[PDB]
Design a protein around this ligand. Structure first.
Ligand SMILES: CCCOc1ccc(C[C@H](CC)C(=O)O)cc1CNC(=O)c1ccc(C(F)(F)F)cc1
Ligand SMILES: CCCOc1ccc(C[C@H](CC)C(=O)O)cc1CNC(=O)c1ccc(C(F)(F)F)cc1
Ligand SMILES: CCCCCCCO[C@@H]1O[C@H](CO)[C@@H](O)[C@H](O)[C@H]1O
Ligand SMILES: CCCCCCCO[C@@H]1O[C@H](CO)[C@@H](O)[C@H](O)[C@H]1O
Lengths: 258, 257
């Protein structure tokens, strides 16, 4: 039962996410991606090497590429969630509420799978943008990038695998205290099942890991704080960068966050 | 032209797959038997097992609660119907909820005509029939919301649509481009235009002698928006003046501004 619950989550994870942490770790080690570290390498990458509103500047273009990856990951998270036991049994408005307040927590957790202390895989791992180059971007666009590296480095130290992350992201999405949730008891019930499955799974998968389950619970609290700060940065970019576009899907997500 | 016939058939199959009651099944029941509910005693009989919730209050509120129940179940079926429609599922989930939020009541009142005649209304999968006169005898403001639906339904049933017609008509109601807060307006308008073209084509083949049928149905869509507007006003009065009466949570989200 509880193994069948976890296996179903793991299969929905492998089915709906093109880039897994296993595939990504093979690329980042050497089992090669074009390194993007300045304007010239980025232009070459955008000229067919690796791969939107009109080109404004270098920092805004990268900002636009960040939005694009979010839109694509929301599509995958929506299909992943719809393959979760009794997520589809929720009314559609509750499904949207869980995705609205959960996608960025899940996105920032899954970014760790394609991130190291030096940079980030882009476009199915065919490219690799460096942390140094992303730091060099203009403000406020550089402000939204570095905190994700800091979280991802410490999160990768826990050495979770795809089977772990499948339950971890499922627990992020099915969160009982999202604002405006209609059927809170049902969501809390599903969440409690996922957390039990997660603890059960971590026992077999990481028998030597000390305090791993409460460590992951703390990571979930960290992710909510990371998203709150990110949402405030995004709202200031919306205020101060009036010529910079925001994808309509992201506009609906950040509308009421404070 | 060739894609339209297949597009229509796919929508009809989604109709037959997801709705508990069709107009074909309903009209055969209404012509010959359902237990007739016409007063308090028959209604109690129906609840005790002959035919079939928040805590009881009174008879008019109990019928009001059963009205909410049929809406909740029809929203479930309309959501599965819409999800089987071409390119509805391709919209982001928040656009799907917006279309359903502002469309389900227009579609519900259109589909209500299938189980209504001038004398009353089928209930509980057609095993019951509640009379129009009994529903009229309920306490205001609860009897206020019932009678205009009969009035719309009898005039709507005069058009003599069948289920294949209604499948496209319901799809056009849901895929409405001017719903408040719609994100991808051009994509919804494009899907609606395809449905309206499929509907026009379908009406020519299925009702070859029917005059002005397609613009009549477009007018019915406008009538349905006015019917829902007046209904929401009446629901606001019930929410204001009947404070002891509960409103199902799904309906609170639909009627929230
Ligand atoms: C791990 C470093 C931080 O990355 C991110 C930080 C924040 C967000 C949240 C978004 C921001 C709009 C949201 O609010 O939705 C997303 C990312 C993901 N970035 C990318 O995938 C990316 C970056 C650069 C390139 C390029 F090649 F162009 F350089 C291509 C892809
Ligand atoms: C054609 C008559 C009008 O019916 C309706 C009017 C308005 C709405 C919209 C709702 C109102 C809360 C909403 O706002 O969502 C729904 C219905 C559907 N009624 C029923 O199916 C029904 C009625 C009575 C019984 C009983 F036998 F118990 F008496 C059982 C079922
Ligand atoms: C089952 C589909 C039909 C559901 C219709 C009800 C939709 O309600 C709306 O759901 C949204 C959350 O997604 C909220 O943001 C809105 O405030 C709310 O009004
Ligand atoms: C693609 C799934 C994840 C996207 C989440 C986007 C959430 O947007 C919300 O959609 C609701 C209608 O559904 C509106 O009522 C809210 O105002 C809006 O904030």
């Amino acid at each position: 039962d509880l193994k069948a619950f976890s296996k179903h989550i793991y299969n929905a994870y492998l089915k709906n996410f093109n880039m897994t942490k296993k595939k990504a770790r093979s690329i980042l080690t050497g089992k090669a991606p074009f390194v993007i570290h300045d304007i010239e390498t980025l232009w070459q990458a955008e000229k067919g090497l690796v791969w939107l509103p009109p080109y404004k500047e270098i920092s805004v273009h990268v900002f636009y590429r960040c939005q694009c990856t979010t839109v694509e990951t929301v599509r995958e998270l929506t299909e992943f969630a719809k393959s979760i036991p009794s997520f589809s049994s929720l009314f559609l408005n509750d499904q949207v509420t869980l995705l609205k307040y959960g996608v960025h927590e899940a996105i920032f957790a899954m970014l760790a799978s394609i991130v190291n202390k030096d940079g980030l895989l882009v476009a199915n791992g065919s490219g690799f943008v460096t942390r140094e180059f992303l730091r060099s971007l203009r403000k406020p666009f550089s402000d939204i990038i570095e905190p994700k590296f800091e979280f991802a480095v410490k999160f990768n130290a826990l050495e979770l695998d795809d089977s772990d992350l499948a339950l971890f992201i499922a627990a992020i999405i099915l969160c009982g205290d999202r604002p405006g949730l209609m059927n809170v008891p049902r969501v809390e019930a599903i969440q409690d099942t996922i957390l039990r499955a997660l603890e059960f799974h971590l026992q077999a998968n990481h028998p030597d890991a000390q305090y791993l389950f409460p460590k992951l619970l703390q990571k979930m609290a960290d992710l909510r704080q990371l998203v709150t700060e990110h949402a405030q940065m995004m709202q200031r970019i919306k205020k101060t960068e009036t010529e910079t576009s925001l994808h309509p899907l992201l506009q609906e997500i950040y509308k009421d966050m404070y």
